[PDB]
């Protein structure tokens, strides 16, 4: 299962900035340590070290028809490189 840690990349006004210092942002599935994501990226993209960062998120609400329901959790992943690029987006 060391390929379904990373889920997809975050594309935001903020994230787009970090693209200008070799810093990328993915959604990592919950229950994954840092080192796991290190391994996953290195083994999926031919890139390197410069320790990752990680987060957590709360849910929110929504009101459609008297229907109050939350949304999923999250876990961002903000990765830093040393020498190579990702011309993948």
């Amino acid at each position: 299962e060391l390929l379904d840690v990373i889920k997809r990349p975050v594309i935001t006004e903020k994230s787009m900035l970090a693209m200008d210092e070799k810093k990328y942002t993915f959604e990592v599935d919950t229950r994954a340590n840092k080192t796991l994501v290190k391994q996953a990226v290195e083994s999926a993209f031919d890139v390197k070290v410069a320790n990752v960062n990680i987060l957590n998120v709360r849910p929110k609400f929504k009101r459609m028809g008297k229907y109050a329901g939350y949304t999923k959790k999250r876990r961002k992943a903000i990765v830093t490189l040393t020498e190579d690029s990702k011309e993948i987006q």
Partner: protein, 61 residues
Amino acid sequence: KVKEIRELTTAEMLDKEKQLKEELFNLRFQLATGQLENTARIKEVRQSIARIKTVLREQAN
């Protein structure tokens, strides 16, 4: 379909498994960046991986 899976040995089984895995990863990424005209393949790959796995199961006991 279904029958072509039964022809290949366990090696080719795991091969096609990893290949479908990679394809799923690429479909996932190209979803988030406004692409993928034919999104109805995101079913096919998961279902094919399912079929390969079960057919593998029935052979190994």
